[model samples]
Target chain A: AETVSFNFNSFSEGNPAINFQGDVTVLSNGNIQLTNLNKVNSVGRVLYAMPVRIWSSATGNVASFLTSFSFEMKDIKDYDPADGIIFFIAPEDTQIPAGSIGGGTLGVSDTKGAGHFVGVEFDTYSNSEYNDPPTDHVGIDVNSVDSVKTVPWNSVSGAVVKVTVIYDSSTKTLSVAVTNDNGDITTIAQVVDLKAKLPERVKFGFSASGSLGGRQIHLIRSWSFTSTLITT
Target chain B: AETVSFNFNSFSEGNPAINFQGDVTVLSNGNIQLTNLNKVNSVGRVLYAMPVRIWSSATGNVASFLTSFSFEMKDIKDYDPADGIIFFIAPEDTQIPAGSIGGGTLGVSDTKGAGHFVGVEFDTYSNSEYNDPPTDHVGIDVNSVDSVKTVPWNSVSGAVVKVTVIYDSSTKTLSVAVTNDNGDITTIAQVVDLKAKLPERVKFGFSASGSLGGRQIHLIRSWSFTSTLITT
Candidate 1:
């Protein structure tokens, strides 16, 4: 069995983004770590975003992926606003609009040209329709800013979970599964045969934004991918 | 600190019901065990009402008490055409009517002089109005034969579980919690406050009946009660 590891502790300061320095044998161990920071627009608020790229030589293309990852101190005072995290898989060289302070940069902007991308968003703050009432769950956004699906979590504590995206080229099937610590798996979405909209080779990563009332932390421990190479 | 243990290694011989040797003292280690048979009716299609008295004195006075009990089986196939379990706390010497096979003995027939009895029944057969799609969960029945509340169990594979009944006299509250090998604690019912119904004293126990097609087996691994005696 082939294996690779993404020990996120490698990146040095001032890089502004976490980097992976391992073989691409398995896309599963992609890890990123984000830490403390003040919210850009408001006092005591923290906001951050990181982007990474995976190159496919045969297609002469670079896939830029963005993910918002972080860890925060629990009992910190003076901060009260909600925060948000986002994951994006977009085409090469396509820039996602860094909209406003709270909702905009959280990847809620127009992702139309970014091709077929899926977002596992942990949105805390209240935007136009995404308001907060002291609950946590995940939402899905397609090409438009409209939310397609949303489900609330049953547990009270912060949980470690894995989100996997399986894309089958032959059948053009895309499905998502979320697994928790208890080994319980829930299928979030099962859209069949949408290969025509996504890129031949795609990018994947995370992004996050903070609100004025309180800042939130987003963390990504690992990510992986599996696909067959297309020979030209 | 006081306790009693009833270990029935086999049920194939004769049916036996063990009377509590003395008032049970609820502590960290207090418990009761029913290994082979805790069921009331086995052969006849009649309703079998098996009552376990909790928080009772030598004279069988059951006032202000808590009861924890359950029904267990090796497999669901043991529940042939009819078989089920019911939880009840009632006055002493009340004869419960054992209904015919499929008639559901949990109805009013089991509560003639039982006085303020509440049944959390797992009925297997369908009655005229209470017939549900074959499933397992808790159903609430008062003096009437009809069910007032029904909560369906999500899965039936794990049938062996710990049914806990906690009664707080000061607040006049009664609640039930169930746990299985999976360590999932489900709060079946909470804040029931049976004190208003039987404020004086009451006996708690398990009742079960099986038809020709169904073979029922009820087990009580352990139980404890905490309450002050009512001086008349």
Candidate 2:
């Protein structure tokens, strides 16, 4: 029996900046500011999301995991900060997939053979291209933007969102919840055989990007993650 | 009412150094080296600060915290063993403050009315300034290089240092523990309300300096810090 647990946090008064890919830095005061805010073309779209995949790259399907993060999306201007972000598990790949434009894409892709991947997107754009809801939302996506299921969410400027996802190797269920301290919570679950849906071992992390057309700063305050073994 | 909790662990295998100021570099083997060690006209008097503030200049109600780290001092040559190091909490300042001398100064400070600052000096030299102890020792400093309490310590070439600092806001107590190479831990504590003595938010980091008389290398293996909210 393999029993594993992890608790990680980032960006705050006393917290330090965590290491991630995609041009991220820890502000002098400890906040994990996503955008360089230095220039329009400099903000990073990727972070620690892929390097973590090295674990599964060789062994494959070695463990089950649970991940969560607390994030803030500040709407700079009209339709700014276009894409929002997503929690994803895909075969080891460092770059964003093709056809994955900034804005409504939420940095999650459908163009590539996304079939072997799964993503839970917290969408903020209308994304008419994907039949997305008019307001911000949370959806379970499998290879395509069509969406397995989704719930409406109000993600205004300067709002804090906490998302938790659990993966159960026994029932092969992957469930997620997005909530605010205001007592509002949105929950969803799906049966998934990571061994089948993803490569034996998958790279798991967060993918966030701002639309080149209307960019917004997305800030992540903290994240707590866990990975445990359920099968003997 | 809002409920918040945090759990952070460090110093394990596969762990990488996260956040800090200046040249405190995290090595691939999970060790944290104090400086770039690049001779910038003697990088001996360097201070790599931590980014977060801990208390008011003096009287801000503070949270309870536990911080521990394992480190080493690499001795280069005879009389080559430079000054010493200091762990401190002071007003959040970006640039290292002035009057910080090497050797007897323990690479910490020399400023009078040092602005709500508290420090723990690991002294290796006995110089004319600040009255030297017979041998190597540790001291609790509040405000100046003049420490409130002092105890003997073993500062040798290539010795591992496992030090712990704990603070209790309710009791207004600040305590410290140093574990020697033999696995023995010496304890010391003090009652002080940092909020009343310093800024509401204070910066916590370590500073090390080497006297032109001698110099040694300092390396940190792991550091873990925990901050818990406290009600006054």
Which CAPRI level is candidate 2? Answer: incorrect
Steric clashes per prediction: 38, 37
Candidate 2 runs further than 4 Å off: A1-65, A69-119, A122-130, A133-163, A166-223, A226-232, B1-28, B35-60, B98-101, B110-116
Instruction: Quote the lDDT for B61 in model 2.
Output: 43
Cα lDDT of model 1 by residue, B41-80, tens digit: 3422111123333333454333333344544533345444
For residues B1-232, could you state the per-residue lDDT of candidate 2 as single tens digits? Answer: 0012222222222211123544455454545555444432122222222234344233344677788876688777544565567777776552454544334544345534243467777877665456657777788888766667788877867888888888887788888999888888777777767776666545565666554546667666655565654322
Scored against the true structure, residue A142 in model 1 reaches a CA lDDT of: 59
Error of 1 at B171 (Å): 4.3
**Fraction of native contacts under 8 Å reproduced by each candidate:** 0.00, 0.03
For all candidates in order, the CA lDDT equals: 0.40, 0.59
What value does DockQ give for candidate 2? Answer: 0.04
In candidate 2, what fraction of native interface contacts survive? 0.03
DockQ of each: 0.01, 0.04
